[PDB]
Each structure stands twice: as structure tokens, then as C-alpha cells.
Design a protein around this ligand. Structure first.
Ligand SMILES: *[C@@H]1O[C@H](CO[C@@H]2O[C@@H](C)[C@@H](O)[C@@H](O)[C@@H]2O)[C@@H](O)[C@H](O)[C@H]1NC(C)=O
Ligand SMILES: [Fe+3]
Ligand SMILES: [Fe+3]
Length: 691
């Protein structure tokens, strides 16, 4: 009775005239309120937003990019949905439409005339120009890419272009006066329908719009027949074959809002009702997805079917997709700065200590490796998704999440074998054998068995790692089907959980006592070395780690203060049969076999990644040319920074090149079951981007 409104930002008069009826019917039916704001452009609307004079606006992919840049930092909150109620989709295709009768393919457009939807729009600009780049002889900056297309076509209509500098880009626009080639409806050849009309009138030879335009604007089925599409493989096809002939599959326009004090429920509360009441044939009083007779797409795309909420972890970069997002950024770069970026491998580092090591490695790589960093593994996977980082080594737990996200395993960390190989010259081709997940306890604790571990104090590598969480919690879950994971044990140190939770009561933080329960190396109780440490310092009663962990931190194998004096004979293993065994019989006393930490990446980087890695280990490997004279890839002494200190080499996958194949049927069924108790913001973001 004081959240007075969700201030919509309008970009024209008709828009505002559309947004007011909107408001008139909203309160008429007692729906949530919405007041209108006026401006003259998408850019003006982005700015009104960033500075609280409006709350939301639906933009095209091209302006989502721009709205997401600092100093604006808007976020897409709701996606338009297209198709029909039975096959809704939150994506569309950018096609290149032509008239039947000619015989020019997509590689033969130089000197033709073109119609575009507007400067910087997905289908009318970003997509067609990026596809065409090979043909433009562009020199890269500072010469604007606009200049290169202006020499490309004889004439065009590119609403918003600078008439000034690029008269050619404005030649075919139909506006009258200063309206000629403006970025609004005053310009008849603006947007999907203006671009399509520029083609129809015989003003341009190709139109760069969306797959529906031809169907929306040509009523009668036979009129459409006068049209064809230019496919990327230099073939023409019927207009309805868009699926097999499009220049790109793109994210749907979306409503953006502020990242910080955005008013996200108000917006969604409003949209949700509006769709219901005034959606696709619901009210002859007012139509949310339709325009008065002289207009097109006021406020929203005509013939959209509703909205789809965008999960909170999503930002512009993630919304656009690595392909699209990077393609946009590549419009402002030379072909040389772009090829240099394709050749280079950017590593994602989890914590300062991994960054430091990565920096070290960076300088010795003769320009092949660079560093990016984040404070959680999840944040690094997000960075690889935005194309902003390319790779990292991951626990099988995280390869699940990464694979759900469409990433792929490329090389695996190889460890000593079932005692085959000696100081193995064929370690890159020696198939991986899994590591053993164990439950360790102090020998003194005579009474501690698997059977009575529950309710005790536990130490975990981190939430969602194989040895440290999936295996122990999975086995336990399987006995009571309870999802109340913070009740399995009285207290714990399970990094990456809520620090206000039981699950974090034993974490001790970094050397100063900050960073408690964070899922990176600043928490002294993190990972393998840290969950072991949690045991040896008597914080916990059981540590869920791997068997070589104990070997490595006892018998003067780790001189660090806390470790110095630990003897193997003091720790024992819990077997699933009730028994306890010495650490050396882990092979007959373990919880499960865990898939090897694997390095993951985007599909586009696989083959270049493979080569940099092979090359780099040949030199900084276990038995490598510069280790230890200068740098050792695989050593950080007990720290397990970037890779596990016991990696012999990075070996080949043998065909298992998908998270499913790599991890195994059984592993994947299990996590999948656990995940049902709770998913992360990240898995929610990726389900959304995958439909
Ligand atoms: C682009 O430059 C083309 C000619 O140059 C060379 O061969 C062609 C096939 C390209 O691969 C190019 O990169 C090579 O330098 C010209 O034929 C063409 O007319 C160029 N420029 C424009 C916009 O016309
Ligand atoms: Fe668009
Ligand atoms: Fe692991």
C-alpha cells in the first residue's frame, strides 16, 4: 500500500500510449500497479533504470549486452517466450530473407543492397555482420566496423547508424526529414517489420530479421512462397525451413532491471498477472502482446506467448551465451587480437593462493597461459561459461555441475597405478583408475565404526566433492532418505555450506580467523589436506578424504607445524562392514572408487587446450624438462593448488568425453538423487539456459 509502482520505461509515444491503457486496465481489474515513463531510446531507458527513474524495459539481445555493462549493470529478469503454448521457446533464429528469383548465396552479397532492423540489434546487426566479417577486409580499430560494411553493400538501411559518417548505411531508409534512418517508428524500415518491408518494396536485396516476421506479416500462405532464406552453407531454402537454415539461434528479448535494488518480485508479480489477464486472447479490452493498427511491438514483441522468469544467478553475459556474448565483443576487436585470444588459454584459479601459483606458471609459458580467478569453483565455471576463462581441474562432483552446464572433460589427472607402470613414460595414455574414498579416524577411538559415525563430528573436503561429500552423504542418504543433511552429524567443517549452520561449526578460517567455511584454500580446513588436518587437530571425529591423503601428511611427509609429528600408525579406516583397518589396506577398506579430477573446458577450446597442456607438462611435468629447476606444475607441497600434488600426468580420456561417460552411470544417478534435496543457483541457471 506503499510499493506504489513498477515504473515501466517507454521509448516512444505510441509505447507510452500503450503503457497507459496497460495501466488503465491493470487497476481496473485490481491487478498490481504500473505507471509509465517516457524516453526516446533504449539507451535512455537503460539510464533511467540505473538511476531509479524507472524499473524495467524489454530489450533485444544487443541492448542486453549494453545494459549489462558498467556503469549500468542491469540484469535480465524475465524472458519473452515465443512459439505456441505447446512448443514455447525462449530463443529465436536470425535468418537472412530474400526474394525468389535471384541466385546469389550468402557468400556473394558484396555490392547488393541490405535492410537491417537497427544498429546493434541481434538479428539486424550483430549476427549478420559477425557472419560476414570474413568478407569485409576490415582493418580492425580504430576504423569503425560501420565503415567496412558501408564499402561492402552499395546501400543499406541501418537505422541508428550515423547518417553523418556512414551515409551509405542510411541510403535506403524511408524516413522523411531528420527521421530518415532514426532508431524508432518514425522510421518505416525500422525493426523486423520495417526491414522486411524494405525487402518487399524492392528497396534492399536481403533482409536481416527473425524467423517469424515472414509469417507474421504475410497473411496468405502463397505470398510467403515468393520468399526464400540464405543458408550458411550457400543454399537457399523455403522460409519454413528456418531450423535448417538460420545464421544463429539467439536468446529471446528480455525485461531488464537493476542488479542491486531491482524490484524483482514486483516486476514478476506484475508480468505474471498481466499475461494471465491480458495475454494471448484473454481480453478484447487490452492485449499485452499486440499493437494498435499503425504500430509493431510496442513494449513487447507481438505474438509473444508469455514470460519465463530468469533464475537469479544469471547476468547478461550468462544470458547471452558464450558464443553470442563473445561474438558481440569480437566486433570491437581486430582479427589479430581475436586470433591471439583463441590461441591463449585462460586458467581459472580458486583463491589467492591458486592465483599466485597460476601467475608463476603464466610468466613461464611463452604466452600460452594466462590467469583469471574467482573465490568459488562455481564462480569459475560461470566465468568459463561467459568465455571469460577457459579452464580448470575439477573434482568429479564439480565435473557433474560443469557437464550440466554443457562443459566437457578434456584430460584427467593420472595418479600412480594398481602398481603396473614404473616412473611411467606412457602416463599420458595410461587409462585412469579412480582414487579411493575413505573415512579416517584416530586409532585411539577404538569404538568408532561406520555403524556409529552418525551424530559425531565430521570434516569434509567441501560440499559437493566426491570423497568429501557425495560418497559419505550418498551412502547415509540411502539409509533414511532424509534430506536434512545438517543433521547427519552433530557438528562439521563442510566448506561451502551456510556459515550459520552446523555444517560450518568446526571450520577455523584462514590464518587470521576470517574466511570461515569458504570453499577455497583460505580455509585451513578445506580440501583433502584440510579435512585431514581437521581430524589430526581433534576438531572432528571422522575425515572424508582419499587414502594417499594420510600417507602424504604423516611420517615427515609434510613438515608443516601441524603435520610434522603425525605417524601413520595413529589413524585407521572405517569399513562398511563394521570393521576398522590400517590405512595401507584401503584397497579392502574404502567407501567407493572416485573418478579422477579431470580438466574441463568449453567445446571450442578442447583441441587447443590439449596441446598447450601436453606441451606445458613436457616442460613442467612430474618428470619434466624444467621441474624443478624453474617451475613444477604439479607441486605446491601438500596444498593441491590447481592440480593435486600427486598428479603423475594429465592423460587422455579414451572416448569418455562427456560428463556422463566420464563419471559413470552409477555416479550420475547418485548425485542426481542428492541434488533433489537441493540444487545450486548455478544448476538452476544452467537448466534455464539449456531448454
Ligand atoms: C576483401 O578483399 C578481397 C580480396 O582480397 C583477397 O582475397 C579475398 C578472397 C579475401 O579472402 C581477402 O581477405 C584477400 O585479401 C576483395 O576481393 C574484396 O573486394 C574485399 N573487400 C571488400 C569489402 O570488397
Ligand atoms: Fe531481436
Ligand atoms: Fe576428489
Amino acid at each position: 500500500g506503499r510499493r506504489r509502482s513498477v515504473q515501466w520505461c517507454a521509448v516512444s509515444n505510441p509505447e507510452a500510449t500503450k503503457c497507459f491503457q496497460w495501466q488503465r486496465n491493470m487497476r481496473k481489474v485490481r491487478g498490481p500497479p504500473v505507471s509509465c515513463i517516457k524516453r526516446d531510446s533504449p539507451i535512455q531507458c537503460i539510464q533511467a533504470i540505473a538511476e531509479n527513474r524507472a524499473d524495467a524495459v524489454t530489450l533485444d539481445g544487443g541492448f542486453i549486452y549494453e545494459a549489462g555493462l558498467a556503469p549500468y549493470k542491469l540484469r535480465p529478469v524475465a524472458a519473452e517466450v515465443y512459439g505456441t503454448e505447446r512448443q514455447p521457446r525462449t530463443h529465436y533464429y536470425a535468418v537472412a530473407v530474400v526474394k525468389k528469383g535471384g541466385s546469389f548465396q550468402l557468400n556473394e552479397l558484396q555490392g547488393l543492397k541490405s535492410c537491417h532492423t537497427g544498429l546493434r540489434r541481434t538479428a539486424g546487426w550483430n549476427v549478420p555482420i559477425g557472419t560476414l566479417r570474413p568478407f569485409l577486409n576490415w582493418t580492425g580499430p580504430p576504423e569503425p566496423i560501420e565503415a567496412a560494411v558501408a564499402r561492402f553493400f552499395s546501400a543499406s538501411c541501418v537505422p541508428g547508424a550515423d547518417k553523418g559518417q556512414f551515409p551509405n548505411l542510411c541510403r535506403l531508409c524511408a524516413g522523411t526529414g531528420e527521421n530518415k534512418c532514426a532508431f524508432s517508428s518514425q522510421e518505416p524500415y525500422f525493426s523486423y517489420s520495417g526491414a522486411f518491408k524494405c525487402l518487399k518494396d524492392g528497396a534492399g536485396d536481403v533482409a536481416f530479421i527473425r524467423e517469424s516476421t515472414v509469417f507474421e506479416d504475410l497473411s496468405d500462405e502463397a505470398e510467403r512462397d515468393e520468399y526464400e532464406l540464405l543458408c550458411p552453407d550457400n543454399t537457399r531454402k523455403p522460409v519454413d525451413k528456418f531450423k535448417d537454415c538460420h545464421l544463429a539461434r539467439v536468446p529471446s528479448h528480455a525485461v531488464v532491471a537493476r542488479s542491486v535494488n531491482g524490484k524483482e518480485d514486483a516486476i514478476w508479480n506484475l508480468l505474471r498477472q498481466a499475461q494471465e489477464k491480458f495475454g494471448k486472447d484473454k481480453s478484447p479490452k487490452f492485449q499485452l502482446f499486440g499493437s494498435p493498427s499503425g504500430q509493431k511491438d510496442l513494449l513487447f514483441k507481438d505474438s509473444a506467448i508469455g514470460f519465463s522468469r530468469v533464475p537469479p544467478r544469471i547476468d547478461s553475459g550468462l544470458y547471452l551465451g558464450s558464443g553470442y556474448f563473445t561474438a558481440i565483443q569480437n566486433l570491437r576487436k581486430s582479427e589479430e587480437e581475436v586470433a591471439a585470444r583463441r590461441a591463449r588459454v585462460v586458467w581459472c584459479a580458486v583463491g589467492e593462493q591458486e592465483l599466485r601459483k597460476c601467475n608463476q606458471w603464466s610468466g613461464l609459458s611463452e604466452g600460452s597461459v594466462t590467469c583469471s580467478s574467482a573465490s568459488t569453483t562455481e564462480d569459475c565455471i560461470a566465468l568459463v561459461l561467459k568465455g571469460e576463462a577457459d579452464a580448470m581441474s575439477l573434482d568429479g562432483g564439480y565435473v557433474y555441475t560443469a557437464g550440466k552446464c554443457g562443459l566437457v572433460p578434456v584430460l584427467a589427472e593420472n595418479y600412480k597405478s594398481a602398481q603396473s607402470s614404473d616412473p611411467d613414460p606412457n602416463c599420458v595414455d595410461r587409462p585412469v583408475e579412480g582414487y579411493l574414498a575413505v573415512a579416517v579416524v584416530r586409532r585411539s577411538d577404538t569404538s568408532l565404526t561406520w555403524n556409529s559415525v552418525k551424530g559425531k563430528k565430521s570434516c569434509h573436503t567441501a560440499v559437493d566433492r566426491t570423497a568429501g561429500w557425495n560418497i559419505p552423504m550418498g551412502l547415509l542418504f540411502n539409509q533414511t532418505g532424509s534430506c536434512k543433511f545438517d543433521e547427519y552429524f552433530s557438528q562439521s567443517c563442510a566448506p561451502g555450506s551456510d556459515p550459520a549452520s552446523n555444517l560450518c561449526a568446526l571450520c577455523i578460517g584462514d590464518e587470521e580467523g576470517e574466511n570461515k567455511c569458504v570453499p577455497n584454500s583460505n580455509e585451513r580446513y578445506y580440501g583433502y589436506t584440510g579435512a585431514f588436518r581437521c581430524l589430526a587437530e581433534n576438531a572432528g571425529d571422522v575425515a572424508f578424504v582419499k587414502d594417499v591423503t594420510v600417507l602424504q601428511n604423516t611420517d615427515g611427509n609434510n613438515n608443516e607445524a601441524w603435520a610434522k609429528d603425525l605417524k601413520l600408525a595413529d589413524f585407521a579406516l572405517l569399513c562398511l562392514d563394521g570393521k576398522r583397518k590400517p590405512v595401507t589396506e584401503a584397497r579392502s577398506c574404502h567407501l567407493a572408487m572416485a573418478p579422477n579430477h579431470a580438466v574441463v573446458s568449453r567445446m571450442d577450446k578442447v583441441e587447443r587446450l590439449k596441446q598447450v597442456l601436453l606441451h606445458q607438462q613436457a616442460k613442467f611435468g612430474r618428470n619434466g624438462s624444467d621441474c624443478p629447476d624453474k617451475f613444477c606444475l604439479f607441486q605446491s607441497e601438500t596444498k593441491n593448488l590447481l592440480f593435486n600434488d600427486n598428479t603423475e600426468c594429465l592423460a587422455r580420456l579414451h572416448g569418455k568425453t562427456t560428463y556422463e561417460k566420464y563419471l559413470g552411470p552409477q555416479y550420475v544417478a547418485g548425485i542426481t538423487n542428492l541434488k533433489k534435496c537441493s540444487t545450486s543457483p548455478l544448476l538452476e541457471a544452467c537448466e534455464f539456459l539449456r531448454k
